[PDB]
């Protein structure tokens, strides 16, 4: 199950980075819509952390060894972090979250595919449930930004 | 016989069923700034609409009537017109649609209040009164969001 | 697109779930006979569940870039379920049979939903149909048991 | 000035006390299919009845009155008749008895509604209206179990 | 009171009248302490109603036929009711509740003895549980009244 | 028009604000046996009063009115008079003051009820009726604590 | 040499002491649970929607007694039966294969039969515990006997009968 | 001794009373996009303000003081100025006015902290500190909504 | 041969697994009792959860679940032994892991059989149960200082 | 008449007071593997003990007695002995100390049961029985954690 | 380094233990009007005292100290004096006794605050400030019940 | 670190790294006591995350710009991470936790002093509350390890 394991570990790195980005958005947001979106980041972070612990623990259960240091997360993740900046608009912050979410849904499709190929049906459901929710969020986020989900 | 109390309860069943459909369409097709507050707010409105619908229908049953209970009956008896879902409608326009729907229901509930008062059906009268109070409060709030007075 | 039929079955479900709700509510209202006190509130539970599937399936369709049916005309014209005027003289067991018939239809609709979404690689939609089908079938067993019959799925 | 309102509230106190007693008798003496549903349903009914009793008695106190407050006063002033407990009454018959008590109560509440309106006691008028709404809903549901229209 | 069923029915009657007396106190009470003791009667009434239902249903379980009319309760009960009087003092009202509770405690002891003698151990426990609570209440009401429980 | 309803709603906003102030003084300056029960009771009464205040004000807004919304407006339009806090007042005197305030409120709510009934503003009418009912129940209880009949 | 190993029919099943009745109850409660669960699954007919969930409530109550009586045996120094083999062999209740074609009336009459048996067993446990002076175990049997008897009344009432204890 | 800790506590009582009044005005008179989020948000702030008011007042009582307890006393002693309510004002102006009242309270709570530190009144010191911490958090968030730095 | 057969097998095996977990709950002695005694309650509630769900899926599918102790004991692959207080905590946990290993294996078989037969509902039931039991093996093994070794 | 029952109730008050003290010592002085489970567990034990203490003392009051109510009285009448706290005692020694306390309490509650039974004090009898049941369950569990039989 | 902060924490342990014992005596021996409010109120006070007790003792453990943990140590180190329970004491004298205990604890907590402030133990300092704040508020309330100023 | 803003940001870095370390322990833990200490790491992480958010938001409130990327956390933190190892014993993992907590308490002491020096009472209290809780944990962890707190 080398590929299932590998994608689970890739997920651990990327979710760790995704959390960090969402927290930056939580903190640096400024503009109309702050009062609704600030707490919404909290909800997203909670959901992301849930996936991260569950995917990492599935890897452990499969006899893997999850990335568990900031260096490992940073060097393995495909997500790039930029310095926090208050001058970003609310709408650009939300577009950043959509971008991160689009990537996560892409990674979870990969994890679904790989685990399906290897017969790891339990890991397959983990990725399917995560992808379901993340795609729902992409619809809602895109809707707030006056756009179709464009999955 | 409470003929008109019964007639107006059934009108309300039809119109509430269509009102719910319109709110659920707004819920789904909404796009633009404010989606995150207004999307779940439609859920709140739909629950309330739904509560009135079941109470009014069951008051009509209680009074010996026969509530409308098919979509055909709802469509053909409602005064509310439905249009196809369109994502290009703005938030402010979507909210305006909801206000128009609520103004109608508020007027309908007024008519039900008046009719039940005259027939001496005080229980029905109270059902309409409570529904109207809440709906008019929603109108104030929606209109305030839209930068406007309630204009009741 | 590659999900054209996934979308088609999601929309079908929206229309049929809307009509199925209408029917359950009719049963809630027009019910008369021994067992009213149990089954009357049970219809509320079914409607609640049905409404949950309705919102979720329509919203998945939106998420896939579709346009859900959202008028009573569209529900009525697209649904394969047929409505009749409410009648207090239908027996409790006839009303329960009617609900069973509706649930059999939805289980089959969800089966096709599963198969179509499965073939298009839309696994999220696949799971939505799968969860709904499971509960609907459990309901069929219970309703049939009340009626003194096997599930006969 | 509020002598009639006061008298009808005290009538309600007596009648509700006796209605409570009849419902508790049904609760205990019930036998036949449906017991498991209707036994606890009688507790729901008794709680509701007890709520009206305390509200109506305390409204009378509030208006400067003196509520009946002994079993003899309840029994002698109530229009409802009690009968000895009997396990051989059928479920259908027991539910029919509750319907009878509830119809009487719905009619008492209409009277109380009427009298309180005539004397300009709008608080008492509301108390009777709310209670009537709920009792009448119960008659619908009970009659339905019995395969009948509410026949209000 | 020949047996356990006889005492159970006696308690059904007395608990019904006890309830009525407590309800009278709830309504007719005036004086300093009203705000505490008004709601407290509700608590006592709920407890009394609990024993009432438990004891009656025990009698049914044993093959009896509980009293179930106001006439039966009033005639079989050893408690006496008087017309409501607002001019009774709050301390007199509490003293009246104590009187009722002392009677009930004594009835429950008689129920305990009879059921013990007959070997009706379920009924025995019912009376013992009820006696315990009533006696604790007598202590507390007596204390409010500046008196020893005097059981 | 609905001018008198709008006027009595606004009077209530002023008078509720001053009543709140008076109850908070009582909560704070209270001394004597009974403090431990009446001190928190004042919180409860304040929560109820603030509930009516917000509801009546927002009803006024909904009707196209403009509620009083400054302490100057409350003080100047209210019929209730305030005095400096004084720890030397007895519990009896504090509770009697609450009763007087409550009596005033019950009377204003009866005026609101009459005016709204005249103008056909049924929603406003019920708001006043609900409030009057609760306030009158409180006057019974306070008066009972003080060893007296409600004497409404 | 070594000590000879006894070969005997290890008969027991003489409800002599509290420990013995506690273990018997352990056995009977396990089988009662099994019967209740069969009624739960195989039930058909008008009343299913009320009685299907009700069996769950009864099962939970029975398991509560099972655990508490078993743990009381442990506390007193005993060794509770803890195998389906031990339960089936020591229990005086009889199990039959599941059958969908039993009326609700027949189902509830079966439950009554098991409950009557349990109440009688708990009465035995009560009497034994009392002669021994085991007042804690005595209480356990009394509490369980009380509620089982209440259920008998109710089930019998659904069936249009007196409790007939 | 406690002389100016008592003084600043009473100042806070007046200012919090007025701040409460302003927040309630904003709640009622707000119109424009953001209404549906900011309207209930004002209730949150009012509950919080009210908490400080009661705690600070009761600390003053505890210290042997006599808190201000009439609208006249609040109005005359508060440094905050009230204006007549106006629906036309924009949401962003409304939020800016709240920020203005909060900045004042934070500066008042600092003076409270300062004077209670020197005088040795450690309990009053912590009350002001906790309140200041939360008001400063609100300034950040309100300013953030308004597209600005906190600028404390 | 089918989903119905694996479902019934699970009914039998879950019944016996419950009994084993209850024996551990009762006979457990040694350091850790205070945490592992109640944990067995958690495991039993979970097991009983699957038991009822799988049994009722069987009924829904037109089957007839095993419903006597004799049917459970005979059809089950798990072997019960007599309760003994002298087993250590670490040995009792080792026993639970073996039972859970067996269950995870059965659930894989159920997953496979239902996948072939195109019975996605039953497939999902087995997939959900397997996920949880495997997670428990990880934790139990970790308490026993070992890898999951699935 | 109930002198023995009163006597044992009061003995229990003293002993439960000292037992609480010993348990709290264990809570504070525990060091070693198992701390994180056993530390909060002593809180569970203390709350249970405190419950018996208050119930038995109040039963004594109810019966006309005068419960020990000072540390001097508790210490002088308790048969349980206290030693100075020592972090150097092992977890397993601490648990053994808890077991010995509970064995004593179990024995005392049996003496209570026996005395109250002889005297016909069934309420006091039931209090000791219920307490003994729970303590004995704890002895089993504590012994199981120490790898031993309950050995009552 | 922190020997004086440790000493005062440990003094608190003894004093809080004796304070608990006094409150429990009051809880049990109380007779007179007000019993039904004050009896349970003693439970709330005991719960609060026990909170400080465990918190202060555990802070002492955390700082490397060894808390008093025996009735002998509590008794011998506490500055509070206990007397035998007396039913013949009035409610008002019982409450006055509680006030004395509380004035003592508030002085103790003031010492604790000052000592810990001098030694730069900011955590222990906050523990004392919080405890003092609450005990002082209770002194106000108890004194108000007794018709007096707090007189801190 | 010269001012309150500087130490608040130091804490943001260090709390982020401390989270990572606790999460490492949660995952790699093996040995008797796992079942207690595994969920305990969750409680610690929840608490750590609380300080992280409060301290960062206080920095924003004061007009600062908190670190908000893994790069900033890892480079600015004085805590060091190692690769996850299943072979570390329970007691060694708990000792790792203790040492992280000891550092954190020392940082919050420094934050207390710096903010007290600058008259920033609000920040002072934040550090004070955090240190109180961390010190209590050190005592309990040390107790589990058979040792004195040794602050
Ligand atoms: Ca007409
Ligand atoms: Ca019919
Ligand atoms: Ca019959
Ligand atoms: Ca404008
Ligand atoms: Cl605007
Ligand atoms: Cl050691
Ligand atoms: Zn974060
Ligand atoms: Zn985890
Ligand atoms: Zn809808
Ligand atoms: Zn309905
Ligand atoms: Zn509907
Ligand atoms: Zn939705
Ligand atoms: Zn009754
Ligand atoms: Zn009442
Ligand atoms: Zn009553
Ligand atoms: Zn009952
Ligand atoms: Zn106020
Ligand atoms: Zn409002
Ligand atoms: Zn089962
Ligand atoms: Zn157990
Ligand atoms: Zn306000
Ligand atoms: Zn207050
Ligand atoms: Zn079991
Ligand atoms: Zn089931
Ligand atoms: Zn203690
Ligand atoms: Zn007590
Ligand atoms: Zn105590
Ligand atoms: Zn502690
Ligand atoms: Zn983490
Ligand atoms: Zn935050």
UniProtKB/Swiss-Prot annotation, chain G:
Indicate the impact reported for residue 96 to A: In strain: KU5
Q: Name the UniProt key words of this record, in alphabetical order.
A: Cytoplasm, Iron, Iron storage, Metal-binding, Oxidoreductase
* SUPFAM superfamilies, per database record: Ferritin-like
Cellular location(s): Cytoplasm
Effect the entry attributes to changing residue 20 to S: In strain: 825
Q: What is the effect of changing residue 164 to G?
A: In strain: KU5
Q: Which GO terms describe its cellular component?
A: cytoplasm
Give the EC number(s) under which this enzyme is classified.
1.16.-.-
Could you say which residues bind Fe cation 2 here? 71
Q: Which GO terms describe its molecular function?
A: ferric iron binding; oxidoreductase activity
The record lists the effect of residue 84 to F as: In strain: 854
Which CDD domains does the record match to this protein? DPS
> Mutating residue 71 to D has which effect?
Decreases the iron incorporation considerably
What's the reported outcome of changing residue 35 to L? In strain: 849
The reported result of mutating residue 52 to A is: Decreases the iron incorporation considerably and induces Fe(2+) oxidation-dependent degradation
Kindly report, in one word, the top-level EC class recorded for this enzyme: oxidoreductase
On subunit structure and binding partners, the annotation says: Homododecamer. The 12 subunits form a hollow sphere into which the mineral iron core can probably be deposited. Can store up to 480 Fe(3+).
Family designation? Belongs to the Dps family.
Its domain comment says:
12 di-nuclear ferroxidase centers are located at the interfaces between subunits related by 2-fold symmetry axes.
| The protein, known as | DNA protection during starvation protein
